Amino acid sequence: NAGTILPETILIVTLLVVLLADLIQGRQADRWTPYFAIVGLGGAIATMIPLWTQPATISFFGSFISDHLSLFFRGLIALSALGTILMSIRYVEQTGSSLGEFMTILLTATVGGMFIAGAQELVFIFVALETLSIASYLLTGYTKRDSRSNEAALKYLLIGAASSAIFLYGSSLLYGLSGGHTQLPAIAQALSSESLGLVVALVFVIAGISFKISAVPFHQWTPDVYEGAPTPVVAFLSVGSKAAGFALAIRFLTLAFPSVTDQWQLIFTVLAILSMILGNVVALAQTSMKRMLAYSSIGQAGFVMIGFVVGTEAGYASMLFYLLVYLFMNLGAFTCVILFSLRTGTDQISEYAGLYQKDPLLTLGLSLCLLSLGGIPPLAGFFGKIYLFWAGWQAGAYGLVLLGLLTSVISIYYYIRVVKMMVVKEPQEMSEAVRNYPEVSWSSFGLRPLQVGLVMTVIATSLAGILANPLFNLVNTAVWDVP
Amino acid sequence: GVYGALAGLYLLVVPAIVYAYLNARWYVASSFERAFMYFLVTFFFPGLLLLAPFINFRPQPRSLNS
Amino acid sequence: ATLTQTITFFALAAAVIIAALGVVLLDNVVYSAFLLGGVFLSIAGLYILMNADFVSAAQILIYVGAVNVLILFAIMLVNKRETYTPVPGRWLRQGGAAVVSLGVFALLTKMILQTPWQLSSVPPTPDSITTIGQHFFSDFLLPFELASVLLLMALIGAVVLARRELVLEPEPILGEEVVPPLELPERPREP
Amino acid sequence: VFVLSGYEYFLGFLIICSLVPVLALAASALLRPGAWIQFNVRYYMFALVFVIFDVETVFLYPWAVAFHQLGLLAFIEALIFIAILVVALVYAWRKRALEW
Amino acid sequence: LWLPLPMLMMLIVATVGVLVAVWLERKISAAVQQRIGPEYIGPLGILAPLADGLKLIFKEDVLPANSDRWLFTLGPAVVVIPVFLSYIIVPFGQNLLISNLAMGVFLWIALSSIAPIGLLMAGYASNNKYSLLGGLRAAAQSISYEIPLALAVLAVAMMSNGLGTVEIVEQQSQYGILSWNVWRQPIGFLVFWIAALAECERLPFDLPEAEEELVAGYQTEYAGMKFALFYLGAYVNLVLSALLVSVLYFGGWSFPIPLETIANLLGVSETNPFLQIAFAVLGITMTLIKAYFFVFLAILLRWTVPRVRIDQLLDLGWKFLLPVGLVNLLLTAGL
Amino acid sequence: QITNYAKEAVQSAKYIGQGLSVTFDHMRRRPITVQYPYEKLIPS
Amino acid sequence: MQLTYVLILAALLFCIGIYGLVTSRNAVRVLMSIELLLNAVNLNLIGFANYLDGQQIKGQVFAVFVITVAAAEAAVGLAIILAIYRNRDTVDMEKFNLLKW
Amino acid sequence: KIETRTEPMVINMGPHHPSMHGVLRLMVTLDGEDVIDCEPVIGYLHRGMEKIAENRTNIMFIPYVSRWDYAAGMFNEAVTVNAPEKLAGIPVPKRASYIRVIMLELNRIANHLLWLGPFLADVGAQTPFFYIFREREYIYDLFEAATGMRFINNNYFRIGGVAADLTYGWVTKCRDFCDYFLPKVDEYERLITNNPIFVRRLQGVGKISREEAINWGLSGPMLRASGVKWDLRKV
């Protein structure tokens, strides 16, 4: 029955081959070992297309399901680590770190998140959440001599292992309210009473579900992890470690708690009406680009919950598609921050000022991924937000879309401010790259994976809204397996 | 545990035989007798520990015939 | 013969909560770290009282014998004899944590008592090393194979974050603009 | 209910062997009259490889006891657990972790 | 006050078992240097374990100057309580067992893991520089030889279909000497025997400091009754580890029909009163004939090998005894 | 591999076997020792 | 001892771990105070397995995986403190507030 | 109380020093595993020997002299009586000249047998320590016959030769010993030359070249193991 975890066991083989080549060959292997992880992750995507037409089996004695939604969220998490290896092939190879030991942790957090999206038992959720979270503490402090990644490794551990203890306390009561029954469909037939034990079991699990996605009372690690961590890790913790948290929020709250359902549509409303506020107004007074993109992803996590709390077939399909186009924006925004940080140091805003005549592939690249996050037409993040507010307006929720619109205008102001300080600043107002840009080459080690990692996202940013009718049918067909 | 029948066979009467055996053939015993000699002490040790300060192995006084 | 299972419960339940206050409130951290074995042994005493003979024998091995030895090495490595005792650092935010911890405790006790549990009067543990091992290879198989992937990653990561950089500490590898060795290239700068 | 058999003598023997030091140190109590260790990270590194391998041993003890009542498919599956954690062992030798 | 009869009869044979192993150390190690050994006390040295331990009581067990007080005293009481609790496993005799725990060769490896903390809270608390260097080294030696020793017991638990130490030695009682586990596990026994010797014996231990990497080890600042627990508590584990060799691999209380000639390590005639008590106590204790061969071996193996340094002591446990411990477990399985 | 650890160890598993029987054959010899209060040694 | 008295023991063992998670000033005492939380979710878990679903223990299997995660989270967890101590030569959680705003 | 700092750790080797070569004090300092500095504090056994010798006659000084090289003994009495017998021109009888050579070569055998005991214990094997003092008591009882003491304090060398001639059953008692001991020199050579652990403790350990071992001022089997072949008996 183990043909359904075949996308992950191509990554577990690939986890060992890119590790064993590090011990055998030893940093002469980094010339070829990043391209084997690409054909392992791409080989993991390529074998779900035989599995997409399969009739959604429940394998491994009820501990793992292979439904249509579990095939979808296993696609984005492998694709985000596909986009990260395209960035990190020069970045961490420029730090002086061994490149084989970085990918062995990153392709373990990838297999962690692929096993959350299809998990069905209370123990397999927790272990798969742990191996994504344990590998995420090691990546954020991986540079190990920075005095910023050291203090960002520890801020993520004393909250992550804390919230993995709150999450276990809600998993344990959920085993205790039912008479045993650690599987998630076996739970929901056993508890229906909506007592006080079920509510404490509900808030304690969405203190760990809504920590990966950084809802705003639990958002505190994200702006302090994201400016300390190495930047390709940040590119995975904003797309991969959020699609993994948004996949758990649908596999848990629609399976374990369908009896209590007016409450986790009300708690996630207060996480939605408050992460759109504090994600967007606090990103105004941020100087660093890696800290501006930190408060964006808190606020961009607030737009996804608008499709979550409404509870319709167009509701969940609107939050699946918005993550599908959010992968084409943060991996094209963080590609350009990396590409700017490798050429010159201190990649912060008010040092981008004076571009557009020195590296105009970056400036055209970074603009269409920052403008689309603010939702201007015709890019992907305009068509992504329209289907949110078409989903919010369909069934109640007249005030959730309106808060998602007055704060979609404040989001315009801090994305434009980078686009202002790239294309409108005259050649008498540039601070760095005052003839200090390195006279661009795209010929060194790993720069050509970065150039193909940016062009295939900017093309996938601008054209994903015009060509959205394939993706709207791929996503609406993944929702009929959600109760 | 037997009260006084089989206990005295282990504690007293057989370890008193070994102490006669230990005095006679200890330094003049062969390479095979010496390894068997260490086994009876490592087996009757709670017996041989009782009658320990009653027997003294000090050598007999010589006669000075010269 | 049954009251000696109640007296040994409350003598173990008071062995943990006086040691759990010891690992938190005590003024010295080595006396705090050694009492953590008192928590882990006394909790292992409760697992035998709850008919969990294997989970107790697996807890003295890991928590007392491996984790607590890992804690004690990681405290003899950092003493440095510089405590600096700045106790009134900024504010009295150690009383605000005493309200949330007392708040969660009074919250959980109201949940525990009033919730009807469906406790069964059947005899447990038919040799719970045989029915715990027929779970590892039928139902809990994929968490058992992922525990191997988690532990291998936890050895790759914990070695490269704690080992000594005696390979090449002064290594200027390359450059477009300057980057220090084993550091992220975004240099710190204040606007 | 307490359906463990054989633990009646474990609580008595826990107290009596605990009364071996506390009474003998009291039986002796009535009869008697530039400080640096160097921070060398090998005491941590030898103990980390213990925790990863003290947990591997725990996971194989339900397998070893209930082996000859499970079969071959539970031996292929239990070989993946050993063969992966061998790669953890080769990683510790090669990266000079347990060198001392 | 120990109203269990089996629990007092075990505490004596765990007490006289020490004084055998102390006396056997001072006579085997004096035989291999061609000297007498301790004469002049008892008959021929029998009261040398009594009198060496009785003088440790009558000395001023004084502390050093600036030391921790509660961890100095609790130092030896964590080394010796789990090696005294784990005598509850060993079932010497056919008609004797103290407690039939449903595990117990896993409870022994669990309880033997607490002893690195006892070398840590004694090396730290004695509070000089050469006991932290010796305490952190003695703690990092029971760490490395513990995973090989726990995988030797994994193999002999695969063959035995359980962890109950009566059910292990009952699988070797059907053919006497043909079904001892040494003949079926000849490579997992040396893994047990080298690792058990490297956790309690006196060849791979830094306490005699003739090499001067430290001052005198971690038990340098200890005296008196506390030192008697580090000294007469090391042979408690030498006997128990030698007992569990002769319980797991070599069959405890298992042997064929005794009706033989006079060459059976006994007297001369067939049916004497001297062989009926050399049989009936052997029908009570058969294992401490076998268990005092490895104590005889571990003392004799001390003078056979050279003193291997700590740089090559942990290059034996991790790099040799653990990979052999793995491939023995697969070979004990099918593969 | 699986074809080395049972042949790269017999290089010293049999050196102790020719070191054990040497030291065990010191026990067969007569203990050369001069017990003082009972066998005093005659001076020159 | 019934089922209820194990849970109030586990609910009290949790909240001493919370109080150490927030108040403790040593960087290592927060790691020991995390381990108290990962025992209170074990004492809750076996106690839910003895009185509920006693015949097939699904809790004592789930009690095994919590120990192996927390042993792997404290092996990772002390590697981080030992990377900080080589850069910042103290362990003081009121000294790691340099990523302020 | 002890703290764990990142400085080089300095340890004191102690003048207690449980070994058989006297009392040094080495303040050696460690850098993890490799030592980086080491000062010897010596003079713990300075009993004022050059100040004694200004207030003694010669025959009052020969009991004092076998305490400098007290492993040897009469290697030091040879130098003391050779101070005025090589200066006043006192002729030595040739039988005494061949008697001295027997004693000085019996001392060098007893000299290398005291070095070898503690040295083999330092590098490994601990049980050949007791089988080597057993070979040393044969040389003691040979000195005990001719001279009235075992290894030191034997006023045997005089300014005019030697003190007294040998005993009666003496030359046939070397021929027992000095033809029994020579199979055992080839026994101690096979402990270290074979058994490839002890050569993994001595190959390259404490190396010095020829030109620095002559410059530092070295003699005897520290100089001759530096490839110098300077022996003062031939020179």
Curated annotation (Swiss-Prot), chain B:
<keyword id="KW-0618">Plastoquinone</keyword>
<keyword id="KW-0813">Transport</keyword>
<dbReference type="GO" id="GO:0031676">
    <property type="term" value="C:plasma membrane-derived thylakoid membrane"/>
</dbReference>
<keyword id="KW-1133">Transmembrane helix</keyword>
<feature type="transmembrane region" description="Helical">
    <location>
        <begin position="35"/>
        <end position="55"/>
    </location>
</feature>
<dbReference type="GO" id="GO:0016655">
    <property type="term" value="F:oxidoreductase activity, acting on NAD(P)H, quinone or similar compound as acceptor"/>
</dbReference>
<keyword id="KW-0793">Thylakoid</keyword>
<dbReference type="InterPro" id="IPR019654">
    <property type="entry name" value="NADH-quinone_OxRdatse_su_L"/>
</dbReference>
<keyword id="KW-0520">NAD</keyword>
<keyword id="KW-0472">Membrane</keyword>
<keyword id="KW-0874">Quinone</keyword>
<keyword id="KW-1278">Translocase</keyword>
From Swiss-Prot, chain D:
<keyword id="KW-0472">Membrane</keyword>
<dbReference type="GO" id="GO:0048038">
    <property type="term" value="F:quinone binding"/>
</dbReference>
<keyword id="KW-0813">Transport</keyword>
<dbReference type="InterPro" id="IPR000440">
    <property type="entry name" value="NADH_UbQ/plastoQ_OxRdtase_su3"/>
</dbReference>
<keyword id="KW-0793">Thylakoid</keyword>
<feature type="transmembrane region" description="Helical">
    <location>
        <begin position="10"/>
        <end position="30"/>
    </location>
</feature>
<keyword id="KW-0618">Plastoquinone</keyword>
<comment type="subunit">
    <text>NDH-1 can be composed of about 15 different subunits; different subcomplexes with different compositions have been identified which probably have different functions.</text>
</comment>
<dbReference type="GO" id="GO:0031676">
    <property type="term" value="C:plasma membrane-derived thylakoid membrane"/>
</dbReference>
<dbReference type="GO" id="GO:0008137">
    <property type="term" value="F:NADH dehydrogenase (ubiquinone) activity"/>
</dbReference>
<feature type="transmembrane region" description="Helical">
    <location>
        <begin position="45"/>
        <end position="65"/>
    </location>
</feature>
<keyword id="KW-1278">Translocase</keyword>
UniProtKB/Swiss-Prot annotation, chain E:
<comment type="similarity">
    <text>Belongs to the complex I subunit 1 family.</text>
</comment>
<feature type="transmembrane region" description="Helical">
    <location>
        <begin position="1"/>
        <end position="20"/>
    </location>
</feature>
<dbReference type="GO" id="GO:0031676">
    <property type="term" value="C:plasma membrane-derived thylakoid membrane"/>
</dbReference>
<feature type="transmembrane region" description="Helical">
    <location>
        <begin position="320"/>
        <end position="335"/>
    </location>
</feature>
<dbReference type="GO" id="GO:0016655">
    <property type="term" value="F:oxidoreductase activity, acting on NAD(P)H, quinone or similar compound as acceptor"/>
</dbReference>
<comment type="subunit">
    <text>NDH-1 is composed of at least 11 different subunits.</text>
</comment>
<feature type="transmembrane region" description="Helical">
    <location>
        <begin position="149"/>
        <end position="169"/>
    </location>
</feature>
<keyword id="KW-0618">Plastoquinone</keyword>
<feature type="transmembrane region" description="Helical">
    <location>
        <begin position="227"/>
        <end position="247"/>
    </location>
</feature>
<keyword id="KW-0521">NADP</keyword>
<feature type="transmembrane region" description="Helical">
    <location>
        <begin position="38"/>
        <end position="58"/>
    </location>
</feature>
<keyword id="KW-1278">Translocase</keyword>
Swiss-Prot record, chain F:
<protein>
    <recommendedName>
        <fullName>NAD(P)H-quinone oxidoreductase subunit I</fullName>
    </recommendedName>
</protein>
<comment type="similarity">
    <text>Belongs to the complex I 23 kDa subunit family.</text>
</comment>
<comment type="function">
    <text>NDH-1 shuttles electrons from an unknown electron donor, via FMN and iron-sulfur (Fe-S) centers, to quinones in the respiratory and/or the photosynthetic chain. The immediate electron acceptor for the enzyme in this species is believed to be plastoquinone. Couples the redox reaction to proton translocation, and thus conserves the redox energy in a proton gradient.</text>
</comment>
<comment type="subunit">
    <text>NDH-1 is composed of at least 11 different subunits.</text>
</comment>
